[PDB]
């Protein structure tokens, strides 16, 4: 019936706007926490290399 | 929502590759420093035994 096809339309419009959130910060935090962990790891690498050669490794 | 399950997947992939380092040298150095200490100790044992018997101990 036409009234049924007037409520189908009235629910499609509702379920098409459910305040979809932006997933931008929630991922840049992950990127940042990857970089920070990587740096804290690289520090271990550097300080072990010094304890090998009494010198931090040359660049490149 | 499907978009939430598209960012969960996008963070699982990030946190599954955080440049995991190889822990091979960092342990062989420990093994080496154990052996070197052991040898420096054995030298004390040998040189005390000589000061006992005027001779280093026979092998085996």
What resolution in angstroms, rounded to 1 decimal?
Answer: 4.1
**B9 to chain A, minimum CA–CA distance in Å?**
11
> Which method was it determined by?
cryo-EM
Provide CB contacts within 8 A for B24, sequence distance 6+: none
DSSP state, A5?
Answer: H
The CA distance from A60 to A32, in Å, is 24
Provide CB contacts within 8 A for A37, sequence distance 6+: B18
The CA distance from A38 to B19, in Å, is 7
The CA distance from B31 to B24, in Å, is 11
Q: In this complex, do A27 and B19 lie within 8 Å of one another by their Cβ atoms?
A: no
DSSP string, chain B: -TTHHHHHHHHHHHHT-S-PPP-SHHHHHHHHHHHHHHHHHHHHHHHHHHHHHSSPPPP-
Q: Residue B15's closest chain A neighbor by CA?
A: A34
Q: In this complex, do A18 and B25 lie within 8 Å of one another by their Cβ atoms?
A: no
Q: In this complex, do B26 and A48 lie within 8 Å of one another by their Cβ atoms?
A: yes
Residue B21: φ, ψ to 5°: -90, 155
């Amino acid at each position: 019936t036409l009234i049924e096809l007037l409520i189908v339309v009235a629910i499609i419009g509702i379920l098409a706007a459910i305040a979809i959130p932006q997933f931008s910060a929630y991922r840049v935090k992950a990127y940042n926490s990857a970089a920070s962990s990587d740096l804290r790891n690289l520090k271990t690498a550097l300080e072990s290399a010094f304890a090998d050669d009494q010198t931090y490794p040359p660049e490149s």
